């Protein structure tokens, strides 16, 4: 019944599972967020209309949890951090809001990551969403191209060379460097 | 007793560490190692320079980090110009360790002139790779972006081989300028290359000027720099 889930281990942190789950029809955006600003839901709250592929969230993931440990990351808490690694910029409240999710928002990824003893109860993370569950191949059909290319600027020369989710990736990597 | 963050910077240097153990390597240099592995369900390579043992640690992990992260920041700067090079991946600054996106099944431009010099017997059919090669460093140049280290063995030929698609790496020693100076130097760095490495291809070095001054605007102080620092 629920095997939708799609979940990962983080190579260089072997303990890490990382977990996605993609949400259609969503009639409670408003309620999720405030929750997750209320820290009664566990894991982060993205937009799925601008992620392209599941390799975009496990790299935001990766770096989230390296900062994690080193006690040196960006915003206030895991959650934030996978979610502002996902954007092009270093401004944090910007990332927050075109990355996270509103009450406009009808379709919805969680992501979150378990490690040890720190585990989620997936079944009652679900029951919060008043929505339905789809298999993460439904993302193509939710993802809006038109979107991503505004948000990341991604340009012609870009695209000559290779993917958008390359770009996209390149970005995100070597922005804390500028 | 000990600093939590210190022990937490160790431990993600240990994990490193863990990480490169059993990996293939794949390519050398004077002070780094790169080996092939995996990156969340992608080929990747990944490049490390190891602290040398005749050197005071801190400056080892200074030199470590300066050159990835200017080698982060060159790749970005090829991605965004339409420049091939590899995507990165990840940029690990406790260990100044590199993922990068691993070109499969390539040969280095290196190689493939000496296995053409050796089954043809002259540098003839070279002429649309040092062409190519013109094209691609002329946009590079023209970006303000100095290699700093252009030989045959950091430009790679993706698969299919015979369309020529060149993919420049090892930027660790590259750094942005738009003096004909340096572009001038990063060029002989190359001819000196291509003379030593690949004796009688004269006409392919030839070639490649032709194109890259034929492709950048720029080129004429560029070559008259060349001229000059060969002399001196
Ligand atoms: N800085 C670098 C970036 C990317 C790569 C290398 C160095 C490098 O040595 N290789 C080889 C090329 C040949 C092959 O088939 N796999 C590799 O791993 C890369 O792909």
Known sequence: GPHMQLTHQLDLFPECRVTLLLFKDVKNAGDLRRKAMEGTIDGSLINPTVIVDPFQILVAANKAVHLYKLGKM??????????????????????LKKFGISANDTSILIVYIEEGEKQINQEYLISQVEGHQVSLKNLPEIMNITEVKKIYKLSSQEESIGTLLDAIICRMSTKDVL | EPAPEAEALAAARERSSRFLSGLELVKQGAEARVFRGRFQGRAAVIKHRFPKGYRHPALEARLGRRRTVQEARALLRCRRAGISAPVVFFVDYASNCLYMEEIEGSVTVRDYIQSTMETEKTPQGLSNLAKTIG???????????????????????????????????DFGLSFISALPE??????????????????????????????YSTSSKKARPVLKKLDEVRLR
């Open chain 2, 182 to 211: 340096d572009k001038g130097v990063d060029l002989y760095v190359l001819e000196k290359a291509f003379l030593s490495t690949h004796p009688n291809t004269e006409t392919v070095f030839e070639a490649f000027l032709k194109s």
């Open chain 1, 74 to 95: 960006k915003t206030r808490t895991l959650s934030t951090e996978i979610i502002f690694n996902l954007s092009p910029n270093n401004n944090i409240s910007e990332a």
């Open chain 2, 135 to 169: 094209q691609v460093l002329a946009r590079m140049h023209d970006e303000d972006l100095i290699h700093g280290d252009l030989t045959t063995s950091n430009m790679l030929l993706k698969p299919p081989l015979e369309q020529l698609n060149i993919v420049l790496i």
